[PDB]
Amino acid sequence: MKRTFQPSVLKRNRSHGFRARMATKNGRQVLARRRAKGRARLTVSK
Template sequence: MPKRTYQPKRIPRQRKLGFMARMSSRGGVRVIRSRRRKGRWKLTV
């Protein structure tokens, strides 16, 4: 039986999807902005 594909780890997740990672690119800034506008309780992971 093969291993499941999703093996969660906190640090890689933060590096890829965290706030600082989002703010480092133009597209990520747009993501944050749209989530703020929508009123999301959590902006990033």
């Protein structure tokens, strides 16, 4: 059966990548939060 995760790198980067996050103020608050938590990987960006 077809499952929910059907990977595509272009769609991954467009939807959640670093530059998509930087494009809006709400996305920059995601990055601010993850930096404050100290995540080793800020985004999906490979």
